[PDB]
Structure formats: C-alpha cells, structure tokens
Copies of this chain bind each other. A is one copy, B any other.
C-alpha cells in the first residue's frame, strides 16, 4: 500500500515522463502547467483534501499558492486547470492508481466522473493535459516529491534488537610485556579502531527522501541488552549505508606473581546487528508532524575482553 499524505502535508507532483512538476499560480499568463523543480516556488506545492461521502476514497489536489483545486474534464475546454470551491465540482476528485514494476513508486491521477487521466509530458503539447483514462500511457504517472521535512528524533525499539552474526575478533593479540620476576609494574595500553556500518532502512510510514542528512545515536549491544551509543556523531544519509569509526582504548597493569611474563589479549565480538526504530519528523514550513518506521542495521562490535595470563 503506497503512502498517501494526510491533509496537512505539502508536496510536488513529479511526472515520470516529463520529469517535471505541476504548477498552479494566479499569474503570469498560463495559470497551470509544468516546471523544473524549484524548492522555493510555492507555485509547485499542493496538499490533498480527503473526499468524504460518495467521494470517500478519492482526493482533491489543492494549490498551496492559490488555494484553488485541480480539475480534469473531457468535454469543456480547457480540459485541465484550477477552480475555487474545495471540491465543489465532481471534476475535482481523483483516484490514485499505483503503478507496477518501474512505476511502483508512481501513480495515475484518474478523475472517474469523466474517465480522464492527468498527463505530464514534454514531447507533446499541452505538456500538462489529460487523456481518456482507458488508454494508459507512461506520461500519465506521477510520484510524490514531498516538502522538506526535518528529522526531529530517532527512537529505537531496543527490546527487539537482534544479533544476526557474531565472530570473536582479537584487537590486540601480541602482548609479550615481561621481565624475570618480582618486578612491580607492567602496564598495557589498548587502542584499536574498527570501521563500523550504519543503515536506516524504511519500513513503513512517511517516505523520507533517500539521502536526507541527519544525526542520531546508533545502536550498541551491551551484554544482555541493546543501548544507544550517543558518542557516534557522524552524519547519516537516510536509506543508505554509512561507515564510521569505533576506537577501543584501555589501560591496565598486571604484576604480583612468583616470576612471570604477563600476556594480555584484548578481544571483541563483531558481527551484523539490526534494531527497529521510529523517526519523528515535522514540516519545516508548518511543523506538521508525521512518523516513519524503520529497521537499523550495521556491522558492530561488543563485549570487549582483556585476558591476562602469566608465562615462565
């Protein structure tokens, strides 16, 4: 089931074919049409009005710049445009039909009452028009290019963390710090770095744009639970694999035997790990709130061990 925004969220209607966005303004000359994306052109933003009654399950597309609603009809010219009255006419209601395969994140905006589908193309004129809904062409598909949203918070569902793999990794094996006997001091210093992995994968809810940059603590396995490592301050990219460093540092000393050659082996458990999470976002322009569910996954390490053993 594709994600359809609620009434207070704004978006751009990007065409698969034209690779351009629909615009609706009060001037210049042409009131509605297509244009290359310009994140600041209020012109290019719309929100939806959820149909009710006999329109339940349908939607009206409202211009943020004009407040007017889009329409699509086949008899009267022009076949498409704007109009007042938030869905006053049957011409303002559309059915959202998700595509398949390469068009799975796209959809047709079909207006039932007239059996017409919106068109967004650059090869034929008018670029923004409609077509008899029964003959499906690729240039009738649209995808949501949502407004800039800010990631306010990431909350992991730690109780459900899970370890997918685990192999011990010896950080500092070599350790032949010795003497003959009755010394008094032998200190060890551990400083090893492992390149870790991080990926925040979409599961459900609001469709955060792939690549969106943000910061958050990342999961860590303690000994019997998962915890959030707030130290990691790297910049992540939504839905993409990121890498970050994890350095293990430790200082310990050993010496109090009849005569030994102290040995220290620092070891950690490394492997793949994933944890569910919810992200809270809000509109930068409005503050409108939404959530997104996801699964975080990455190569990590845990259970740092220091084993001391004497030799003679």
Contacts and interface: CB of A to CB of B under 8 A. Distances in A.
A256 interface: yes
Given A100-B213, A270-B164, A272-B165, A38 B137 contact: yes
Nearest to A203: B243
A250 B311 CA distance: 13
B138 A37 contact: yes
Interface stretch (A52-60, A67-75, A277-285, A302-310): A302-310
Given A211-B104, A212-B101, A271 B304 contact: no
A299 interface: yes
Contacts of A178: none
Contact of A138 (B38, B102, B165): B38
A100 B240 CA distance: 13
Given A36-B137, A256-B249, A305 B304 contact: no
Nearest to A123: B122
Q: Chain A interface residue count: which class?
A: 35 or more
In this complex, the member of A35, A40, A249, A253 whose beta carbon has the largest number of chain B beta carbons within 10 angstroms is: A253
Tallying the copies of this chain within the complex gives 6
Contact of A256 (B123, B209, B252, B270): B252
Contacts of A164: 165, 167, 270-272, 299
B256 A38 contact: no
B306 A309 contact: yes
A305 to B, nearest CB: 6
